[PDB]
């Protein structure tokens, strides 16, 4: 049983390697230190880390963002340190509760939330530049940046594009552990059950699919680690028995296969599709669909079931019923 797949039996140590970037080499700060335990199930070396302007601007904004949020959370518990720590999950920074349309809202009712969102956005943008640049600097394709771009795009969608489209900040996602989660239900309830939103389903399909692909891709490589499967790059440029067997394993199993390079494209695509799909679902929601369930009924999709307990007429529609 290749134990190498479980953890590294004999760790190794050697001179700290470094690849020069088209720039920013002098911006790598930190002293590479090793961790024995980490190295058991990974690479022991921790650091150094590239700084750069993007990275700094990122922390700059992110922090500003985080600070605006915490201060507001703190303000919720009236700054009582014990309750703040106790009620943390329940604390949050909410978008405007009242309807102001697209008008900038009062600081105490959406204003702060709006600002936090602005700084978080700029922070995300800067980090995107970072993820992108580092790629160019190291002479690599900008694939990650694109997948990450989809993710930032989706955040923008639930964050302000959707609210913009329907014209109301109150639709935004609040900052907070439980709070941002409570939004998922309020949002779904409002748009008539997200389970009936085709894009929700698509997104889930790809998510679940990413699960299937990594479990499968990962197990595949471990299963061929004895042949070097993990050295994917040279497996691409020079097919080796590793990927040949990886391929035949699947072809003989499901009838068709991929290449060591293509499977990464599949995975990349799937990942991307999770975010692209949901972005569309959100862009469509509120804008052109108000109740995904009725929308499905309209197009003959929604399933129906017999009543178990007697069907119940809406009381409010009966003759002579209160308001």
């Amino acid at each position: 049983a290749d134990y190498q797949t479980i953890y590294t039996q004999i760790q190794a140590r050697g001179p700290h390697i470094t690849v020069s970037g088209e720039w920013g080499d002098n911006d790598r700060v930190g002293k590479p230190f090793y961790s024995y335990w980490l190295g058991k199930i990974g690479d022991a070396q921790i650091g150094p880390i590239y700084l750069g302007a993007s990275g700094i601007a990122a922390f700059a904004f992110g922090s500003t963002a985080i600070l605006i949020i915490l201060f507001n959370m703190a303000a919720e518990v009236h700054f009582d340190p014990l309750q703040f720590f106790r009620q943390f999950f329940w604390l949050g920074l909410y978008p405007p509760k009242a309807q102001y349309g697209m008008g900038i809202p009062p600081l105490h009712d959406g204003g702060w939330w709006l600002m936090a969102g602005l700084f978080m956005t700029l922070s995300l943008g800067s980090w995107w530049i970072r993820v992108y640049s580092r790629a160019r600097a190291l002479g690599l394709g900008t694939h990650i940046a694109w997948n990450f771009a989809a993710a930032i795009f989706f955040v923008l969608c639930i964050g302000c594009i959707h609210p913009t489209l329907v014209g109301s900040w109150s639709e935004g996602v609040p900052f907070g552990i439980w709070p941002h989660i409570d939004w998922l239900t309020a949002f779904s309830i409002r748009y008539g059950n997200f389970y009936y939103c085709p894009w929700h389903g698509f997104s889930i399909g790809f998510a679940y699919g990413c699960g299937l692909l990594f479990a499968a891709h990962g197990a595949t490589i471990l299963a061929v680690a004895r042949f070097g499967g993990d050295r994917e790059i040279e497996q691409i440029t020079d097919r080796g028995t590793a990927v040949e067997r990886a391929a035949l394993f699947w072809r003989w199993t499901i009838g068709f296969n991929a290449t060591i390079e293509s499977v990464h494209r599949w995975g990349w695509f799937f990942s991307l599709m999770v975010m692209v799909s949901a972005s569309v679902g959100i862009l469509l929601t509120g804008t052109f669909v108000d109740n995904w369930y009725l929308w499905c009924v309209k197009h003959g999709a929604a399933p129906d079931y017999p009543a178990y307990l007697p069907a119940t007429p809406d009381p409010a529609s009966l003759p002579g019923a209160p308001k």
Binding site: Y3, T5, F227, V289
Partner: protein, 258 residues
């Protein structure tokens, strides 16, 4: 009136619904599956009388040849004509193609089945800067075993049949990943060293257990041209050797377990 509502009882969402599936299938069939085909294609099948022609389907499934300009000079273009030049000591066991082949000689040396290796380049995988990537510590001076982990150097290697087969002489490290990939051991009885992928090693404190092959079979382990260097193809020959042991090490290794 309704936002999103269009003519013939149809709405924006509904159109996007179709567009979506369209894009998906487009990418999946026209792009991805094409890429899944940059290796192993065009397929192979036995000919006889007359059957010489491009065959329409075979041109449609393939994608345009892409070319990889290697980091240390050279290029590789895929897909491409990479037929198995080698002679396989295998024989048909029955009629139809679905019939499994059978080793006529010794699968381990013949390199068939699980013991099969890819016809990789007969070149030494390099480091980001031309140095040999996989080298033995005797060369990897600045590389060492992490404090706390076993140092197999000196420890004996017990084979499947339970019996010392040799002594771990060295450890080949990946200077690009800082990961030990092979253990070099002296083959007791036949003056010569052999490599064994760490993955086939159960690294203990007093010994190195190797269940893949038997003690004797350690002599036939493929040899390297150099002693402090290894070529991708050699890495395959070596790894492949042990893997074939999993099925061929002994007679029962290939039969039905339960």
């Amino acid at each position: 009136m309704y936002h999103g509502a269009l003519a013939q009882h149809l709405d924006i969402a509904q159109l996007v619904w179709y567009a979506q599936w369209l894009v998906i299938w487009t990418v999946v069939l026209l792009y991805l599956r094409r890429e899944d085909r940059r290796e192993g294609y065009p397929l192979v099948e036995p000919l006889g009388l007359v059957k010489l022609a491009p065959e329409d389907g075979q041109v449609y499934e393939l994608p345009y040849p892409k070319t990889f300009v290697l980091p240390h000079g050279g290029t590789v273009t895929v897909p491409r004509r990479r037929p198995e030049t080698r002679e396989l000591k295998l024989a048909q066991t029955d009629g139809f193609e679905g019939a499994p082949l059978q080793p006529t000689g010794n699968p381990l040396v013949d390199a068939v089945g699980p013991a099969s290796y890819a016809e990789r380049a007969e070149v030494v995988d390099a480091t980001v800067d031309g140095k040999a990537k996989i080298v033995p510590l005797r060369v990897a001076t600045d590389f060492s075993i992490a404090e706390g982990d076993v140092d197999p150097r000196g420890l004996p290697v017990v084979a499947a049949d339970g019996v010392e087969a040799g002594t771990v002489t060295d450890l080949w490290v990946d200077r690009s990943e800082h990961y030990f990939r092979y253990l070099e051991l002296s083959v007791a009885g036949s003056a010569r060293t052999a490599l064994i992928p760490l993955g086939f090693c159960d690294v203990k404190k007093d010994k190195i257990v190797v269940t893949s092959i038997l003690s004797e079979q350690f002599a036939n382990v493929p040899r390297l041209q150099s002693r402090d260097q290894i070529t991708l193809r050699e890495e395959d020959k070596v790894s492949a050797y042990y893997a074939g042991g999993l099925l061929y090490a002994t007679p029962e290794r290939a039969e039905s377990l339960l």
